[PDB]
Write a protein that binds this DNA or RNA. Structure first.
Lengths: 55, 70, 23, 629
RNA sequence: UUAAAUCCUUUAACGAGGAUCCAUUGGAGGGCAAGUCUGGUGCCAGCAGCCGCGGUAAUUCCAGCUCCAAUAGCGUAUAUU
RNA sequence: GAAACCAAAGUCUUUGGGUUCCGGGGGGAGUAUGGUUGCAAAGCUGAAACUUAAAGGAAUUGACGGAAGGGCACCACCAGG
């Protein structure tokens, strides 16, 4: 009666990880993060948009 | 069944498909589940989770980083 | 006169048994 | 507990008990009463030259055994009060390493200083982790031939490089005779890893082999296998399995002198007639006018790669769409899917386990209660002592019916390992084996493909069936061996009592066995139903509210009438059923629970119990040494 | 340098264009920073300290992309404040 | 003061008049066991393993009443066709 182990992990279709260029590390990541949140600020009427707002 | 005292325990095996890494009569390292002696979440009466089987972690086995001998 | 369900009444479950080792 | 002196007394009592048990288990390996401590030595990298390592390792007294190819010796010392028997394997040589690692008490891995192991060293190490590891010890050979600035970094680099396989294990270094004595001292005093399959049965490594034919034209005669018994007490009435050559009767056990005793002819038993075990794998007993119609009479080289890419396409198709079959337009579906039926619920709909059995079940054996029989057999091997040959005695075995080839294989260099079986282990049944797939190999393996099994000291070819590893009475067939899942491989084979390791290999090309999968043996029963599913798909092209007209799923009118009682389901989660076929072709009216989308798809599942193929043959070709492609 | 060395420090020669000399570990419903994105699954497998999610449109499972936190570190178990 | 309420249930983060018993999320349980008292019934003293995410208190609205009174209709009845 039922009691499968790893039905959904093994059934999901295997999609390969993309090849992307690497991330900056250390101080330069903090610089790129600082520049994105305080330097070229894009004005909005009420700010309902997050950093990862998708649709 | 614990080695040092012989007392019997039910222990949860966390991620999905992770029960297939365990066979009968092998060494299992078990930690607490979280609530210091209390049952955690859905599982009734279970205070323990397995951490290692045959001296390889469940996490490396689940993510495919190592392989277990027997 | 037969369909997918009724035809399974024609399968006899007593013919090709493997030999039983008793306990 | 109370009363501090009493609880300290309780602790001292328990310490005495456990320490008595430890002193029991430590006398059984390399001692006066015990058999020789067998050490297999395996060099994991191709740069490693084994001969100067074993010349380091031979120094006690050395008694060199000899074969055509393999060169192995006996070491005996009273400085450690220990008797070792060393053997040498080459990784990549599959049968030799696997054969004398299932008898060795300790594996000694030899490592390159610069890199960890060879790629073939990884292949061997995967096969050894998968088939059962004994006690093991790491050793490295080339650290001393470096400046010390390089030595410290080289040892740290190795210690990083081995942690993926040996995570926290101290690796010793072997360059001198003082380090040879240090390594021998390490190997003598260790926690022994016990392998269960060795422990329940009565196994033997062949130290000498003598053959006398009864008739040379028959090319058969009695064989004299002499060595130290290792497992349980060896009884003559039970059969004897030679690992690569099958299981057969042994005639006589006698005890000559132990040729290498630690500190310096008689017939023990002859086999009875009635009390002997029989060699029986299978079951032996088998008024109309001229022109009118009926419509009015109611009133009165590259082809292998082509199949390879075809198997690639079939594997990619049976994961996007797990069991979907296009129904054939030429053959009626009630005939091409004649043996199929529809189950309301794959969990709770009944299936008779004995309903339609083939003629191959009339040839195998079944168990009334396999758990009770296994428990009884194990209780009668542990708790009951038999008057055969006790453990550690240098004995000689006269086996009766055995072909010539074994002997010259022994002269070639192949080790001979013989183990005495449990009752009911020559007889054929349906073995179920849980198994998962090696990341090393990614070739698609179909369901009934011929593969090589290493199932617990045996080795054979067979064609399995792959099933979901579920808790239900029905288990669904897998048409391909999926990469990360755990599956059950089901096949006819002689019965083995678990625990037992399982390895699955594929004959690649020019004699290379590629390890495709590994696992263990689950309970034996031919009662395990394996159900092949076919999912038929049709397109609902006239959708009304709660009713639809569906096409392309059958192509006759009475195809719809035959498969009427099967419940239809829907890719977007709806559930319904057939009412009427409308056209002469396979158009049908179907009533559903909710309104269907025009984007949607109707489909039904059909089921039949599939059985394995009788394709068991114990002969398996010797591999070539393995290499990467 | 030191007993003799190793390491550090001082110094010649060689040593950097992103397919390299390639940063991880945990998360992304609320508490609590960070997606109502796409595919799979369909009260199953699983997640979830707690509230809870999953029974056919899953912000929570398994994945892909993306974002968040700390960072040569970051998770978990336990004792203790 | 949570309020209902309370000239005490006040003089309390502006917290100290003297002193006695006594509680510490709900259960297991005023149970077991030991002691003690009693002719007995029982009384006094009184656990733990385990189990659980709420039990509880004061107020506030009013689905539905098998709660009650009224009004209306030949798609309700009465007398009929």
């Amino acid at each position: 009666s039922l009691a499968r182990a790893g039905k959904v992990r093994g059934q999901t279709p295997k999609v390969a990880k993309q090849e992307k260029k690497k991330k900056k590390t250390g101080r330069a990541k903090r610089r790129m993060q600082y520049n994105r949140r305080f330097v070229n600020v894009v004005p909005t009427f009420g700010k309902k948009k997050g950093p990862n707002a998708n649709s | 069944q614990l080695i040092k005292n012989g007392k019997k325990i039910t222990a949860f095996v966390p991620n999905d498909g992770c029960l297939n890494f365990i066979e009968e009569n092998d060494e299992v390292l078990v930690a607490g589940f979280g609530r210091k002696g209390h049952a955690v979440g859905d599982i009734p009466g279970v205070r323990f989770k397995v951490v290692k089987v045959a001296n390889v972690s469940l996490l490396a086995l689940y993510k495919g980083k190592k392989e277990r001998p027997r | 006169k037969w369909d997918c369900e009724s035809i399974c009444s024609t399968y006899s479950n007593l013919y090709n048994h493997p030999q039983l080792i008793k306990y | 507990e109370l009363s501090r002196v009493d609880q300290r007394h309780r602790a001292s009592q328990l310490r005495k008990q456990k320490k008595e048990a430890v002193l029991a288990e430590k006398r059984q390996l390399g001692g006066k009463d015990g058999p020789p401590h067998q050490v297999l030595v395996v060099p994991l990298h191709s740069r490693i030259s084994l001969p100067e390592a074993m010349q380091l390792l031979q120094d006690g007294t050395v008694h060199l055994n000899e074969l055509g190819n393999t060169q192995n010796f006996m070491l005996l010392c009273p400085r450690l009060k220990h008797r070792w028997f060393f053997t040498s394997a080459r990784p990549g040589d599959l049968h030799v390493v696997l054969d004398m690692a299932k008898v060795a008490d300790t594996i000694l891995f030899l490592l390159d200083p610069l890199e960890g192991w060879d790629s073939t060293g990884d292949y061997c190490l995967s096969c050894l982790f998968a088939q059962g590891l004994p006690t093991y010890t790491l050793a490295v050979q080339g650290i001393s031939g470096l400046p010390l600035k390089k030595q410290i970094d080289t040892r740290k680099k190795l210690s990083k490089a081995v942690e993926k396989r040996f995570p926290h294990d101290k690796l010793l270094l072997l360059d001198t005779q003082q380090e040879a004595g240090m390594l021998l001292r390490q190997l003598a005093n260790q926690k022994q890893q016990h392998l269960a399959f060795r422990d329940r049965r009565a196994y033997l490594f062949a130290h000498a082999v003598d053959f006398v034919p009864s008739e040379e034209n028959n090319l058969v005669g009695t064989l004299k296998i002499s060595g130290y018994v290792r497992g349980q007490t060896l009884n003559v009435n039970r059969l004897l399995h030679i690992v690569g050559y099958g299981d057969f009767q042994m005639k006589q056990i006698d005890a000559p002198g132990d040729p290498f005793p630690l500190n310096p002819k008689v017939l023990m038993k002859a086999d009875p007639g009635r009390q002997e075990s029989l060699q029986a794998e299978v079951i032996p007993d088998p008024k109309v006018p001229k022109g009118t119609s009926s419509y009015q009479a109611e009133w009165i080289d590259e082809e292998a790669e082509a199949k390879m890419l075809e198997k690639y396409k079939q594997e990619r198709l049976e994961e996007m769409f797990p069991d979907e079959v296009d129904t054939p337009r030429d053959v009626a579906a009630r005939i091409r899917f004649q043996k199929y039926r529809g189950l309301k619920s794959f969990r709770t709909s009944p299936w008779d386990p004995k309903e339609n059995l083939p003629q191959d079940y009339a040839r195998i054996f079944q168990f009334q209660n396999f758990t009770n029989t296994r428990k009884s057999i194990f209780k009668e091997v542990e708790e009951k002592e038999v008057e055969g040959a006790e453990v550690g005695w240098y004995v000689t075995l006269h086996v009766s019916e055995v072909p010539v080839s074994v002997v010259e294989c022994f002269r070639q260099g192949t080790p001979l390992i013989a183990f005495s079986l449990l009752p009911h282990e020559q007889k054929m049944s349906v073995l179920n084996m849980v198994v998962r797939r090696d990341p090393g190999n990614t070739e698609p393996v179909k369901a009934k493909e011929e593969l090589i099994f290493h199932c617990g000291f045996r080795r054979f070819r067979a064609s399995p069936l792959f099933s979901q590893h579920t808790a239900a009475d029905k288990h669904k067939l897998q048409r391909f061996l999926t990469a990360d899942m755990a599956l059950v491989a089901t096949v006819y084979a002689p019965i083995t009592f678990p625990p037992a390791s399982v390895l699955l290999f594929k004959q690649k090309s020019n004699g290379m066995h590629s390890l495709i999968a590994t696992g263990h043996l689950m309970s034996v029963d031919p009662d395990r139903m394996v159900i092949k599913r076919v999912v038929l798909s049709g397109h609902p092209f006239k959708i009304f509210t709660k009713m639809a007209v569906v096409r392309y799923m059958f192509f006759n009118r009475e195809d719809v009438l035959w498969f009427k009682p099967v419940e239809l389901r829907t890719k977007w989660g709806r559930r319904g059923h057939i009412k009427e076929p409308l056209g002469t072709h396979g158009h049908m009216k179907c009533s559903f629970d909710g309104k269907l989308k025009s984007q949607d798809t109707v489909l039904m599942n059909l089921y039949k119990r599939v059985f394995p193929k009788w394709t068991y043959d114990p002969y398996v070709p010797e591999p070539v040494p393995w290499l990467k492609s």
